[PDB]
Design an enzyme around this catalytic site. Structure first.
Site, short mmCIF file in Angstrom:
data_model
loop_
_atom_site.label_atom_id
_atom_site.label_comp_id
_atom_site.label_asym_id
_atom_site.label_seq_id
_atom_site.Cartn_x
_atom_site.Cartn_y
_atom_site.Cartn_z
N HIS B 41 16.21 31.95 58.71
CA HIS B 41 15.69 31.10 57.61
C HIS B 41 16.44 31.39 56.30
O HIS B 41 16.18 30.66 55.31
CB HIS B 41 14.16 31.16 57.55
N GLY B 143 10.99 37.68 49.17
CA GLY B 143 12.23 38.49 49.22
C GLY B 143 12.15 39.66 50.19
O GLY B 143 13.18 40.36 50.34
N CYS B 145 11.44 39.42 53.54
CA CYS B 145 11.93 38.96 54.86
C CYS B 145 13.21 39.71 55.22
O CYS B 145 14.06 39.90 54.33
CB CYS B 145 12.19 37.46 54.88
C1 LIG Z 1 11.27 29.21 57.31
O1 LIG Z 1 9.98 28.90 56.84
C2 LIG Z 1 8.91 29.59 57.42
O2 LIG Z 1 9.06 30.20 58.42
C3 LIG Z 1 7.53 29.53 56.77
C4 LIG Z 1 6.40 29.61 57.57
C5 LIG Z 1 5.14 29.55 57.00
C6 LIG Z 1 5.02 29.41 55.62
S1 LIG Z 1 3.37 29.33 54.89
N1 LIG Z 1 3.04 30.73 53.97
O3 LIG Z 1 3.24 28.12 54.08
O4 LIG Z 1 2.34 29.13 55.91
C7 LIG Z 1 6.15 29.33 54.82
C8 LIG Z 1 7.41 29.40 55.40
#
Ligand SMILES: COC(=O)c1ccc(S(N)(=O)=O)cc1
Ligand SMILES: COC(=O)c1ccc(S(N)(=O)=O)cc1
EC number: 3.4.19.12
Lengths: 304, 304
Positions: B41, B143, B145
């Site tokens: 991502h 940040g 991840c």
């Molecule tokens: C790459 O994007 C994701 O994997 C992602 C998954 C969930 C959420 S969330 N906190 O809105 O549920 C946000 C982003």
């Protein structure tokens, strides 16, 4: 989101951990520059420990009697001295992994990371608080003495604790890195009762702020209180009295959350008077007091 | 004595943490040998995140579009590939601090240490469990991840977790280091509800053994039970069913303490049915389930 009992990354401290052997006693030493710091009880024979005369015991000891091993390489000891309850062993080699560091004597209620070590080898890291009674609730087996408590500010390790002994009650006592005990504790095998273990009120309040920030709000009430009204309740529940300094230190959490310190105080008062009623806060069924306001701000902002 | 939620010393992992920037997105990468591993991502623009086509997005990306910074030195990227939900960035330099390591996909109920990182910089270390529902209850801000979970066996780091996302409920989901999600989670911004978060029964029992070893015994009762009787109670309290494998794994704690597993089961049953009655166990007012039998043996024997 989420809130965890977080320790500092321990790498900077791992590279400072050595094994110190004197006679048949092995424990942990901290190697910073060309000095290895360890508990002076390394010179004790199991039988000296009732009332050791450390000055008399140390006369019998020469530089070559202190075996300092850093991993599987031996350090040459070129000097030794006693400062309070620690030995400083001058070695002929500066630790090449010496981080920027300071020795700091912490206040009760202040938190730090322990790198628990055995034979100069790290086993684990956890976050502790200096209890108001100058004990820590640690995890230390035989051979863990000389394990150190620290804080990290960007790149500077502040060493605040060296582990020395377990009290008969299984709480832990130790020194700063100048070898002064926290509390009234002495490095000898005798009756040492700790005082009343009071709760660190300002840390509970910080943790209540951390909870609100993380979505755990059920305990926020319609009440407020005063410093004096609150402290009447603190006193009853063996909570440390809250001061305007404490309130000031909570200022940024107050500001971020828009919950006045005294309102949060009134929420804590109800929690003390009514208990949790089988609910949890940040996955805990009791009031957590081993996060400082600074720990909450740090964890709830991503400081590295 | 004393029992703490202990993490592995994080040093070996600290020396593997890098920053990965693609376009305007920065997160953490893990540098082992000449490969940097990060969440795929990193290639997402905030607007791709609803349903990103990672294959289509990755076509637009060249080796030079992946900025890999290890402290304040830039790594030359000479290859890139997607394996499941991670990117592998081949760099022209092997990490000189690469520890002995393995990639291991852990079982639910298994525990590990998280080195939480921001811009490739470590902020803290804590101990986690893979929940039965394949979430972890972490502490992760924007940040974080690419922060990794690991175990250490003497000198070998077993990487088991890379952090990817926070669910709308503020629990955490991620992959192994081959980039396969734990659980049914996908790396996209959508409704992802976790299943029932059950309690890890074998870990609670291990922690009850750890308590007995450390002097907390008030909950030891005059009763025993059977695997089937016990599991009727587990089922009611959303506890994982206990198997003979679980019993076997508790064998050394049973042996050390002389308390039969099924007797301890009967103590747990009473605790579930009657609650703690305002008492604590190892300073906790609820049943702790993020210590494995192996964690109890390790901490209660001093393994480094
Ligand atoms: C790459 O994007 C994701 O994997 C992602 C998954 C969930 C959420 S969330 N906190 O809105 O549920 C946000 C982003
Ligand atoms: C150097 O010796 C000591 O400092 C010491 C203190 C206390 C105890 S203990 N666990 O018997 O109370 C044992 C040893």
């Amino acid at each position: 989101s989420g809130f965890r009992k977080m320790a500092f990354p321990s790498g900077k401290v791992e590279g400072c951990m050595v094994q110190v052997t004197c006679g048949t006693t092995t424990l942990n030493g901290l190697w910073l520059d060309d000095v290895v710091y360890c508990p002076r009880h390394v010179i004790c024979t199991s039988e000296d420990m009732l009332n050791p005369n450390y000055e008399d015991l140390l006369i019998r000891k020469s530089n070559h009697n202190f075996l300092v091993q850093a991993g599987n390489v031996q350090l040459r000891v070129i000097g030794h001295s006693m400062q309070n309850c620690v030995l400083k062993l001058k070695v002929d080699t500066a630790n090449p992994k010496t981080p920027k560091y300071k020795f700091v004597r912490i206040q009760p209620g202040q938190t730090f990371s322990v790198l628990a070590c055995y034979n100069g080898s790290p086993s684990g890291v956890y976050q502790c608080a200096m209890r108001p009674n100058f004990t820590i609730k640690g995890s230390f087996l035989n051979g863990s003495c000389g394990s150190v408590g620290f804080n990290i500010d960007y790149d500077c390790v502040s060493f605040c604790y060296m582990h020395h002994m377990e009290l008969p009650t299984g709480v832990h006592a130790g020194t700063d890195l100048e070898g002064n005990f926290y509390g009234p504790f002495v490095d000898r095998q005798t009756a040492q009762a700790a005082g009343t273990d009071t709760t660190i009120t300002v840390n509970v309040l910080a943790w209540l702020y951390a909870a609100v920030i993380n979505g755990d709000r059920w305990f926020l009430n319609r009440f407020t209180t005063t410093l004096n009204d609150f402290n009447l309740v603190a006193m009853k529940y063996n909570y440390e009295p809250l001061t305007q300094d404490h309130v000031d230190i909570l200022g940024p959490l107050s500001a971020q959350t828009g919950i006045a310190v005294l309102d949060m105080c009134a929420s804590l008062k109800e929690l003390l008077q009514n208990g949790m009623n089988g609910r949890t806060i940040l996955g805990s069924a009791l009031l957590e007091d081993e996060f400082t306001p600074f720990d909450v701000v740090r964890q709830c902002s991503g400081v590295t």
